[model samples]
Target: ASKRALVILAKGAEEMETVIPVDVMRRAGIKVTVAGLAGKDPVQCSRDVVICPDASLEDAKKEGPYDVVVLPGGNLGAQNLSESAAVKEILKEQENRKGLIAAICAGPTALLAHEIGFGSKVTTHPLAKDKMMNGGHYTYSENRVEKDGLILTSRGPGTSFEFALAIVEALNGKEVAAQVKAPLVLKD
Candidate 1:
């Protein structure tokens, strides 16, 4: 069966952080769902880029147990996710099922909010490090993309491609990741 990913889209999300992974995963043949937190309307990103989600998160969760659950970043976007009971439920379920949970930039802060993956080694945008490390629940990393077991994390927009390719490699394989990366002309 093909791998599937769920990307939670909320208002004030980072456009690059959201789109890069979704696009990269699709290129690796994964079924990627961009679900909106506030129903099917277009989400206004932190930079004011608008993107329409494929479905409402409420509807999408029913189709759950995806191979990976992706969270994008913006301070406000992470806050929205942090405050969501639904997001809490979804993330908890994914963790219990041993599925992959990927977050980038401020996205990892939501994982902290949901209290998922405590004790896993993680990396977040440098500005978010203090928040993520509030209790020292997780060991920190400076890696461009840090994947410790099922919890995957990355830095800011600068690391989105590496982050996405890491997800592709995790779901698919190194061969597929290399194939996808070559055409993008990413530096060696």
Candidate 2:
């Protein structure tokens, strides 16, 4: 059976943040659904890059109990995810099911907003530290990619690939993750 991932796309989402994870996950052979927050329409990203969603979030939710739920970051995009009751329900359901919830940059702010993972070690964009730490509910980490059980997070666009592979490893396996990474020529 194919492992599925749900990526929530909102207006003002960081294009790099959204694209990197979705593209990399597909490379790792994960089934990814790029869901639009507003409706079945193109989303205007933070840098004005527009992307057509594979499905509206409402429709996507009906087809899901995904292995992972991805939250891409932009200040505005995170705020959009933070405010959606639909998003809140989706995150809560994923958490209750002990599924992976991955966020990046200000995307972690939505995890904070939904109160999804209260005590996990998480990371976010340096600029987003204060917002993520406002109440000190969760331990913070400086790692480029921090995975605390199922709540995985990363710093920013720069760490997106690392974050995506981490998800691949968790859901797929280290060997599969390595096989996928090898072709990307990321050897350092």
Q: Candidate 2: give its CA RMSD in angstroms.
A: 0.7
Question: Candidate 2: lDDT of 92?
Answer: 97
TM-score for each of the candidates: 0.98, 0.98
Per-residue lDDT of candidate 2, residues 79-159 (tens digit): 999999999999999999999999999999998889999989999999999999989999999999999988999999989
lDDT of 1 at 125: 94
lDDT of each: 0.95, 0.95
| Deviation from native of the Cα of residue 61 in model 1, angstroms | 0.6
Which 10-residue window in model 2 sums to the lowest lDDT? Answer: 179-188
Give one digit per residue, the lDDT tens place, for model 1 in 1-188: 98999999999999999999999999999999999998999999999999999999999999877999999999999999999999999999999999999999999999988899999999999999999999999999999899999999999998999999999999999999999998998986
Q: Which stretches of candidate 1 lie over 4 Å from their true place?
A: none
Candidate 2 collision pairs: none
True-vs-predicted CA distance for residue 97, candidate 1, Å: 0.5
TM-score of 1: 0.98
